[PDB]
Amino acid sequence: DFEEKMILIRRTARMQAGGRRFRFGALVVVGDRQGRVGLGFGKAPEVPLAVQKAGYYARRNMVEVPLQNGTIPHEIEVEFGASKIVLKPAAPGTGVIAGAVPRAILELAGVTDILTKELGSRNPINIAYATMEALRQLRTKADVERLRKG
């Protein structure tokens, strides 16, 4: 019902008297490839617990993507922190052209052909959040005319 794929897994460390103590953080995307995505970042003392927790958080934070023939309706440009994401629709037969993080996010959303570009900071966390906010800032012609009814 729901497909799940992790973006990256890292091991952070705090300092305590006697040595460093580790804590694992993991990004997880979940999607049905129908137009719904979810992104979660889980932290746990061990890796599998962190992956499961990131999956829970990703299912809790969902985004409805307005797909139009497997591509995006209009080009977007999002600044999350110092990271920038540039999304642009593409004609079918092109394929998802993106870095690992946006490729995974958009593929789990049900996108087949799109042109992206990461700018500024390449940080996978900020890039993931920028792509999520980009998909959250998408509008359709129906929504546009819905706003301009008056």
Partner RNA sequence: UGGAGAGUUUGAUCCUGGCUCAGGGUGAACGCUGGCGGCGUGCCUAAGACAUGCAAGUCGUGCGGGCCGCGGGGUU
Question: What residues line the site for RNA (CB under 7 A)?
Answer: 10, 12-15, 20, 75, 81-83, 86, 88, 90-91, 93-94, 97-101, 103, 113, 115-118, 120-127
Joined tokens for residue 150: 């008056």
Applying CB under 5 A, the span of 61-69, 71-79, 81-89, 118-126 interacting with K ion comes to 71-79
Torsion of CA 105, 110, 115, 119, to 10 degrees: -20
| Nearest-approach distance from CB 79 to K ion, in angstroms | 4
Joined tokens for residue 87: 């999304």
Of 107 and 118, CB closest to RNA: 118
* Residue 79 interacting with K ion (CB under 5 A): yes
The residue with its CB nearest to Mg ion is 64
Are β-strands 114-120 and 96-97 bridged in parallel, bridged antiparallel, or unpaired? parallel
* Residue 136 interacting with K ion (CB under 5 A): no
Joined tokens for residue 26: 């993991």
Of 32 and 133, CB closest to RNA: 133
What values do phi and psi take at 61, rounded to 5?
A: -110, 100
Number of shown-chain residues binding K ion (CB under 5 A): 1
Q: Would you tell me how many other CB atoms lie within 10 Å of the CB of residue 74?
A: 15
| Nearest-approach distance from CB 48 to Mg ion, in angstroms | 27
* Residue 141 interacting with Mg ion (CB under 5 A): no
How many whole angstroms separate alpha carbon 52 and alpha carbon 36?
Answer: 19
The three-state secondary structure class of 15 is strand
Residues in touch with Mg ion (CB under 5 A): 64, 66, 82
